[PDB]
Amino acid sequence: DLLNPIGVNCIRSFPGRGIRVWGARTLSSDPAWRYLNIRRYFNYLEES
Amino acid sequence: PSYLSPGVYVEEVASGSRPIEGVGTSVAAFVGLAPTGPLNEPTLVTNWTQYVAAFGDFTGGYYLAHSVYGFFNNGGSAAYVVRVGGSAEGGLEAIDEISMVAVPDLMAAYQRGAIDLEAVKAVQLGLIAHCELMGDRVAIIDPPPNQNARQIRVWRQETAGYDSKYAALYYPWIKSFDPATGQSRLVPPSGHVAGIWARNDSERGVHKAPANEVVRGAVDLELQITRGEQDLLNPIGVNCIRSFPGRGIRVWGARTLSSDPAWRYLNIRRYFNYLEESILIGTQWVVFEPNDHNLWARIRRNVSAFLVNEWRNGALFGQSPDQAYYVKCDEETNPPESVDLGRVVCEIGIAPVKPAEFVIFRLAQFS
Amino acid sequence: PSYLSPGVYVEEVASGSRPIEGVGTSVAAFVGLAPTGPLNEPTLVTNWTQYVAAFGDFTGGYYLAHSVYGFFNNGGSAAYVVRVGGSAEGGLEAIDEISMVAVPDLMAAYQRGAIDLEAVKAVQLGLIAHCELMGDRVAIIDPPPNQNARQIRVWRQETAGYDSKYAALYYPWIKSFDPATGQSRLVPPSGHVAGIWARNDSERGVHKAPANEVVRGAVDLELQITRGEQDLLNPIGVNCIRSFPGRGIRVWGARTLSSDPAWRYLNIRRYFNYLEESILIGTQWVVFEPNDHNLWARIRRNVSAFLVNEWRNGALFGQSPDQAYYVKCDEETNPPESVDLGRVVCEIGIAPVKPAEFVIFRLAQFS
Amino acid sequence: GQSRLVPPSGHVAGIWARNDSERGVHKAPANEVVRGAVDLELQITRGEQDLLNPIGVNCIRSFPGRGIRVWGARTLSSDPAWRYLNIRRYFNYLEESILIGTQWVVFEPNDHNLWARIRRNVSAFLVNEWRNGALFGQSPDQAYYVKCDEETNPPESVDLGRVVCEIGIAPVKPAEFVIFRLAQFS
Amino acid sequence: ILIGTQWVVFEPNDHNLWARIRRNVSAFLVNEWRNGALFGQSPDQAYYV
């Protein structure tokens, strides 16, 4: 909860599910491009 | 709530039902003198065997044992006992469940010790003041032993006005048996009326006035009252114990000491005390709340449910729920200036029921 | 504000609501003599156990213990105690919450010490002057013990004119019980009236005149007043304690010592003191302000909200808010010459309510 | 293994954190149980509390049947505008959020499109805050108001490059005194 | 009337008190009239408070 507000993702160990990615964020102060999937989809659309 | 990390959060919304329960009103506290036992301790008794094992039984000729036996004879459930003193030759403010207080053995000191009338008047006034301060208990009073008509009516008005709306006075004394000597002797009617009240509260609801009940356990009265004498004592708060030819000894009058016509009857006061106690006990969760219209809706729902449950037992006068009660809590009674200081009103109004005292027929002849 | 560098600035505009709250008027300060305890220290007591642990209880035959017991018997909340002296054989100006002051044990020195009448008159005049200087407290006065009609009416006019509009005198003494000797004896009515005032202020609003209240613990009076004698004492600021056949001992008259007809009644003075204290406490933020019409609008809004909240409880005489109060703060009452010196007026006018003393019916016969 | 007296410093902070976690920050921590304690070495009656309530002194009260609980939820402020703690906490939260999430607006062409965007963003944030019950009002129109137009942005003001965006909200206050009537009517 | 009115003394003296007094007197007079002790076909013609 201290690292989530900043663009720092995590790799977390869960007791029963193992090692998993967690957070799926990027380094951007602008709230328009907070998430990675939006940027990837926009890049795909622009290239096409 | 605060959301800062991904995951699954489970929370419970406070919106629901919070029922309010009643309280038991069948506990009495007797203060008196006993031969042996704990001193200045409010002991709890629930059966004669406990009283016999603790404070003895019928050896000093005191009025505490007779009163306790009469209270348990009329269907009592639980009692508190305070022993001021005695021979072998109180802190009632710390208790909560007590509903009535009595001092059965007080005229004994007046009869032999010659403690004058000023001391008795001061003790009774102090008991009345304590009852008024507590706001939950009702006092039972008895007059001096040897009086008749045209005397008690004086003693009530020129010497013992009392009023205070928190008392009930029972005039005639009761002659009862004593197995220690196996003889009949006179005792004040202190525990018997408490037992009758407990029996009425157990068999029926607290809204029923204990007006017609048989004083089980007595034998005589040493006094007789006609219709005219009762008609002279009825306007003032003096009840009676009447002998009927075919029905025996019965209570009669069911009134209290109050000049104000608002609290003439005992059952209204008892029901109001019960409602106030229940509301005070089952509402404390409302303090320190966001104070929005949701809180008003919840309070209205809870009060309406409680009042509907009370009305469905026949304790309120009305053919429909709309004519029996009304609860108001909205923006009309909560202006922004009032809610600025953090206040909730929740106006409540009920319509009680009153006992039927005079029954009149006509028996007319018509074509 | 000053803007010199690029960025984001967050500021709060003072425009809003600033509610004004009331003050507690149920604190009394008793000055007297006690056997043992702290000396010349205004101790705070809130229950008899504290008084018993600090200043003892019923051992020197003084009037402080009786007054404190009577005050706590009539529903008192918190008290201040000052002990001038005593045997085992005040700085009230530093306190703020005190609402009334009494000196219950003063006639004791007059009865045995032979301190003459000049000393008593000087002490009472000093207390009156202190009450007037403070401008927040009300004094309770009692007369010398052994007097009757045609004497007190002299003692009030040729010796103890007093007036000053900041006092209330209670004529008859009260006979009360003492458990140390278990005997009845006479005491002045000093703490009982304070307890009655506190009870009236707690149960109902401060605008209700304590005219019909029962003195708890009152046994006898050692004097009887007819209608004519009361009609001779009513025009002057002498209240009474009357015995009614069926209602007991009750207060009667609810008046004060003031020749000016503007402050005849006690409730008006109490309400004005409450309003003045509330306004003085909850207004200090207005000093050193830009003094524009926005400030006038804010002050008018706050005062109007407070007055509306006060009126909605039924403490002001009027069917509509327009007929109950009026607040004026505009350019008509604030000329440029006045605002040059930096002054604000904010004229306020209210219409109080007065108690109903004489009730008259007609009972006419008409066709 | 012994009992000893300590000041109430960390317990109140823990209670504040618990209240902020379970419920929103707008709820006043007025009725919470001090887990971990045992005694108080002092007792307060109603009158003493009534003497301490007008001043900014809170209390920890023992109730016969409910135990040790916080009581009063007030602060040290003579000004009647900030009497309660929850108002101050909510205002701090709002100010911090606004300061953090607005920096993109600086150095913009400063046309009516920017005003529309700012108004839309602030209105969305305020609606989201209000839908959780943290603002007093039956309708969104009675809960908040945001003004950013040509009325509050004259050409003289926009000459220097200034944006105002007046914002006004209506907070909620805790209910301290609960009063019933219990009247008798026909 | 003398016996059952003493509670009215020392009251705030507002229109609520007037309404209460009028209601009480009207109820008493209606109860008295319904027994046939007053001359009138309607309550309006029997009394006025």
Numbering used by the authors:
A (entry chain B): 390 to 437
B (entry chain A), C (entry chain M): 2 to 90, 249 to 526
D (entry chain H): 341 to 526
E (entry chain G): 438 to 486
Cite, word for word, the article reporting this structure:
In general, CIS are composed of a contractile sheath that surrounds an inner tube loaded with effectors, fitted with a baseplate complex. A conformational change in the baseplate complex triggers the contraction of the outer sheath, which leads to the propulsion of the inner tube into the target. Here we provide evidence that CIS from the model organism Streptomyces coelicolor (CISSc) function intracellularly and belong to a new class of CIS that exist as free-floating fully assembled particles in the cytoplasm and mediate cell death in response to stress conditions. Similar to the recently described sheath structures observed in AlgoCIS15 and tCIS19, the CISSc sheath is composed of a single protein, Cis2.
To obtain insights into the structural details of the CISSc contractile sheath-tube module, we performed single-particle cryoEM (helical reconstruction) of purified sheath particles from WT S. coelicolor, which had a homogeneous length for the contracted sheath of ~140 nm. The resulting map reached a resolution of 3.6 Å. Contracted sheath proteins adopt a right-handed helical array with an inner diameter of 115 Å and an outer diameter of 233 Å. Cis2 monomers consist of three domains and are well conserved in S. coelicolor and S. venezuelae, sharing ~65% sequence identity. From the resulting map, it was possible to build de novo domains 1 and 2, which contribute to the sheath wall. The additional domain 3, which is located on the sheath surface, seems to be highly flexible and could not be resolved. The overall contracted structure of Cis2 is similar to sheaths of previously characterized systems.
